[PDB]
Design a protein around this ligand. Structure first.
Ligand SMILES: NC(=O)c1cccc(Cl)c1
Ligand SMILES: NC(=O)c1cccc(Cl)c1
Lengths: 264, 264
């Protein structure tokens, strides 16, 4: 992988692996999400970087995902080369946004796009906060100054408010627990695991006859290593679904989301 | 990746990804096992394939009976690991796939693995010896003189594994596969069983030791709607364990294995 000519974005090529594909012999949305995370990590490493600035480490501040939005037009087949370009943009004091463009390496056509919102949090107390002047100054030199959006369209799917699923849910998958492969190097549950858990409550018949086109996921709270999750889904309609992940016992919300599926 | 000069083995280089590492910032044994499977798939594709012409006609497949992996050094995040793989016929019993892992920079062997595969009818699940017609079709892709990753006289790769007796010292109850655990054929990936074995190892061992050796027997599959119990008993500065995976209800065995851990 490499930073582009202007040093304001990063590109990387990936060959889709045999274990990364589903029953359609194309990459799962979880493989795509893992690759987006990997190209995001290589971008931070290439520019001097958890990927925190000098002041953030001193104050015990980290970047945490508030929302992930992914739209796939074509899932790459096993053996195909996919190229991903990623960049960051400051959204003032609210936080930052990381965006991605996925392309077929052979045709150069855009096969997908993603956008994510990140907020600053104290890693010990878990308290959110606006981004400081000094912290902003440290990372602004790595972001394009004019807006560059993967989802430019006014009133698009990436910024829509998501409601809370009401009981009873139409479908459910209960007792989901993370295993050691679900944890990252910091012993926290990988953000991609939550996408898998959302997808667990989609009926098999939808998975078999439809392809996932859009997934928007809000992150409210973490699932700890010893927590148990219930995944809930209700059809709101192409097929559209409303999703809710909550802790198995008290019913404490961890995530909410929506999916849009297209008939094959 | 590429077949070597003589066309009897295959080599591939892999850069270790951010999500592929554990708490030590080096590749998990499940990442290693996934890579072994990937280089095995690319080898079969490069030589014309994962069944021969006669196998497809008779509805016969290759299934893993045993996997044995020994790691001397786990590659760090960002490191390049090179893996060489080859197959050998073991007469009518079946075949063996072997692997050598090396650090690309030093050329030092950092790991090795060996696996035994048997022929099974896809539909009835009945095993069978390898016929001459099938043998003739794949023998041209194997070295004729023996080439063993584990040449040693009384090495760990061929030791008989006993059945863990109740009560187990440790256990992890109610493990269930999710859609990311399935391969393109909708069967549970062989690497998931390694993860489930490791689930019953106490955290203190994972935190202070490194896994050196894992030997795993495969007896029966876990189906998409099955629930598994992972059982471990210490059999021993090195720690050794006896492992058993069984179906949560009737206690039907699916796997048995052993692990050897060395203090960090
Ligand atoms: N991790 C960061 O602070 C950050 C901010 C902007 C661009 C990049 Cl590459 C990284
Ligand atoms: N899949 C096979 O039958 C096989 C047998 C020997 C070598 C290789 Cl590369 C493949």
């Amino acid at each position: 992988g490499s930073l582009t000519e202007d040093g304001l974005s990063y590109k990387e090529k990936f060959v889709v692996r045999s274990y990364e594909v589903g029953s359609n012999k194309t990459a799962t949305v979880e493989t795509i999400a893992n690759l987006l995370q990997e190209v995001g990590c290589n971008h931070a490493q290439s520019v001097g970087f958890f990927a925190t600035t000098t002041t953030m480490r001193k104050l015990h501040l980290i970047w945490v995902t508030a929302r992930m939005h992914i739209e796939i037009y074509k899932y790459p087949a096993w053996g195909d080369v996919v190229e991903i370009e990623t960049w960051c943009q400051s959204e003032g004091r609210i936080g930052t946004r990381r965006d991605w463009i996925l392309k077929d390496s052979v045709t150069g056509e855009v096969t997908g796009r993603a956008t994510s919102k990140w907020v600053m949090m104290n890693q010990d107390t878990r308290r959110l906060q606006k981004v400081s002047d000094d912290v902003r100054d440290e990372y602004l030199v790595f972001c394009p100054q004019e807006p560059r959006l993967a989802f430019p369209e006014e009133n698009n799917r990436s910024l829509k408010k998501i409601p809370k699923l009401e009981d009873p849910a139409q479908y459910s998958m209960i007792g989901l627990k993370p295993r050691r492969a679900d944890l990252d190097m910091n012993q926290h549950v990988n953000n991609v695991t939550y996408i898998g858990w959302v997808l667990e409550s989609i009926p098999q018949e939808i998975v078999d006859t439809h392809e996932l086109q859009v997934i928007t996921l809000d992150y409210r709270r973490e699932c700890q290593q010893d927590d148990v999750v219930d995944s809930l889904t209700t059809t709101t309609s192409d097929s559209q679904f409303l999703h809710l992940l909550r802790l198995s016992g008290d019913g404490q919300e961890i995530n909410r989301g929506t999916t849009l599926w297209r008939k094959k």
